[PDB]
Amino acid sequence: MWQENKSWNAHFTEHKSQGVVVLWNENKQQGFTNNLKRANQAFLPASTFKIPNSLIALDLGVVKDEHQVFKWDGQTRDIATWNRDHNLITAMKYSVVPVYQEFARQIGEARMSKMLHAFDYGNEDISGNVDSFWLDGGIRISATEQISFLRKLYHNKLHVSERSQRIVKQAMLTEANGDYIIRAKTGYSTRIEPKIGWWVGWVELDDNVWFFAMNMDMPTSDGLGLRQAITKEVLKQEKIIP
Amino acid sequence: MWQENKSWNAHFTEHKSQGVVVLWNENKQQGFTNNLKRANQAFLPASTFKIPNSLIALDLGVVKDEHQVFKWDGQTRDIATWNRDHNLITAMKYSVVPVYQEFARQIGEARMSKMLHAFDYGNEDISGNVDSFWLDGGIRISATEQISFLRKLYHNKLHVSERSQRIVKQAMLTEANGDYIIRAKTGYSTRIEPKIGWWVGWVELDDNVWFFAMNMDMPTSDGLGLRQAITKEVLKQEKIIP
Ligand SMILES: O=S(=O)(O)c1ccc(-c2ccc(S(=O)(=O)O)cc2)cc1
Numbered sequence: 409m410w411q412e413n414k415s416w417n418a419h420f421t422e423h424k425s426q427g428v429v430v431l432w433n434e435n436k437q438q439g440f441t442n443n444l445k446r447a448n449q450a451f452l453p454a455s456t457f458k459i460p461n462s463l464i465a466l467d468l469g470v471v472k473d474e475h476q477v478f479k480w481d482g483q484t485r486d487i488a489t490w491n492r493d494h495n496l497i498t499a500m501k502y503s504v505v506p507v508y509q510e511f512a513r514q515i516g517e518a519r520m521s522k523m524l525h526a527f528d529y530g531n532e533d534i535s536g537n538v539d540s541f542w543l544d545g546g547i548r549i550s551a552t553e554q555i556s557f558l559r560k561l562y563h564n565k566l567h568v569s570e571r572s573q574r575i576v577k578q579a580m581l582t583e584a585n586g587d588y589i590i591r592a593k594t595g596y597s598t599r600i601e602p603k604i605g606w607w608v609g610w611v612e613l614d615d616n617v618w619f620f621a622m623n624m625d626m627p628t629s630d631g632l633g634l635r636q637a638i639t640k641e642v643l644k645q646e647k648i649i650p
Numbered sequence: 651m652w653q654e655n656k657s658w659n660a661h662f663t664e665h666k667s668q669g670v671v672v673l674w675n676e677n678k679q680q681g682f683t684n685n686l687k688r689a690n691q692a693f694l695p696a697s698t699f700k701i702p703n704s705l706i707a708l709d710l711g712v713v714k715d716e717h718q719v720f721k722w723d724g725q726t727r728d729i730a731t732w733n734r735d736h737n738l739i740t741a742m743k744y745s746v747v748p749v750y751q752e753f754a755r756q757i758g759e760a761r762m763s764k765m766l767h768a769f770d771y772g773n774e775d776i777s778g779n780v781d782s783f784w785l786d787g788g789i790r791i792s793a794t795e796q797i798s799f800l801r802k803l804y805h806n807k808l809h810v811s812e813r814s815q816r817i818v819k820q821a822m823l824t825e826a827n828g829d830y831i832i833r834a835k836t837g838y839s840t841r842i843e844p845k846i847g848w849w850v851g852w853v854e855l856d857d858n859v860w861f862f863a864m865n866m867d868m869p870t871s872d873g874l875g876l877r878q879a880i881t882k883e884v885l886k887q888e889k890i891i892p
């Protein structure tokens with residue numbers, strides 16, 4: 409069911425990095441990883457939590473559709489793409505934290521806890537601040553737990569409307585060409601050690617889907633593109649993408 | 651409403667070709683084309699009909715979802731990608747006619763005719779074989795009529811469920827990167843003169859969507875790649891994509 413391939417560590421060492429990549433072959437019901445232990449260690453989800461947060465806001469009517477505009481609050485922040493109006497698509501694409509903090513406040517603690525319990529998401533713990541617990545609160549999730557959550561979403565099995573799940577999967581769209589489709593979400597856990605970069609999602613092929621969940625040590629923002637670079641190197645090594 | 655911009659004709663003359671490109675700026679509600687007459691000339695839709703065909707098959711339950719596998723019927727045909735099992739996603743990607751002919755036969759002429767009238771689709775005529783009328787029957791649609799149909803699909807305003815429209819828009823996914831998303835459908839009218847190629851769809855940006863419908867003279871299959879190349883050069887010139 410699960411099997412270890414330490415050859416992938418070469419792609420992390422090439423960049424003075426350390427992390428885990430978890431792959432799940434859906435047709436084969438078989439998984440692969442370079443580090444079985446780290447694959448099952450739980451971290452703050454950071455902005456990968458925007459996937460469940462989006463599903464919850466949509467199912468509860470906090471967000472009516474993927475076109476609804478959440479207007480900039482006028483506060484100029486460090487990330488320039490945040491200083492503008494957004495909808496669900498662009499809020500996801502640029503990980504616009506302030507938009508999702510507003511979602512979390514509207515959802516509230518009671519509804520957020522009950523939804524995460526129904527999702528079986530990570531340790532299901534929302535302890536901490538209602539609008540920041542996924543960045544510095546008590547919630548934790550492993551790479552394999554991310555995949556288990558992503559598989560339910562792919563098959564429309566979560567306890568939200570199929571419509572909510574289809575909208576979030578549209579918003580997760582990251583890349584598409586004649587060879588594959590990638591639906592994924594980045595994340596960067598900075599507030600609580602150890603600082604890690606996330607990348608979770610899946611690769612749609614003609615005949616199959618490969619779910620993936622990776623995280624890696626990330627001491628600064630400069631290495632964030634290594635998330636994408638290293639995952640693709642593993643995908644290329646395993647003959648999943650050309 | 652429509653502004654003629656015949657500088658685009660340069661992009662057709664470079665490649666020994668002739669045709670029309672039609673653009674619709676959704677935010678501004680203004681349209682652009684290099685040839686208003688041809689923009690309103692109605693042709694056989696060819697495999698661009700796979701968009702309404704998909705919508706009807708899904709709304710009637712002929713297609714359960716985008717994952718349902720439709721087995722190869724065993725007959726080896728000239729296009730190698732057709733000689734395999736398909737789902738809705740890959741049947742649209744590779745324009746697998748025999749799969750959609752089976753859809754059309756199950757839909758039947760009565761429901762096909764009723765649905766195209768509800769869709770306001772072209773001249774709404776399905777005379778000929780129910781499983782080939784978009785290739786050699788009486789149906790005709792112009793580039794501007796493709797735009798108006800696609801605009802309803804984008805806004806979920808066609809007379810089918812929101813679910814069917816979301817699934818078909820997912821299946822139209824052609825290309826996606828950090829700059830744009832293209833949902834579109836190719837078509838090649840081969841059986842009745844004039845032989846023409848189609849490309850219809852839209853380009854999703856952060857802040858806007860640009861609908862497009864193009865067709866061009868296509869006497870040989872060697873020029874089919876010019877549909878996307880010419881369209882993209884127009885999009886590049888208009889600063890829609892980089
Ligand atoms: O602590 S702040 O509230 O100012 C903060 C700033 C930035 C981020 C951030 C960074 C990168 C990414 S992503 O590259 O992984 O998508 C996602 C989110 C999170 C929190």
Ligand SMILES: O=S(=O)(O)c1ccc(-c2ccc(S(=O)(=O)O)cc2)cc1
Nearest residue numbers: 697744745747836837838840841874
């Ligand atoms: O007449 S046949 O039944 O043998 C036939 C053969 C080929 C095609 C065809 C060709 C190209 C494209 S596409 O490049 O626009 O996607 C779509 C469809 C249609 C019918």
Ligand SMILES: [Cl-]
Nearest residue numbers: 578581820823
């Ligand atoms: Cl999509």
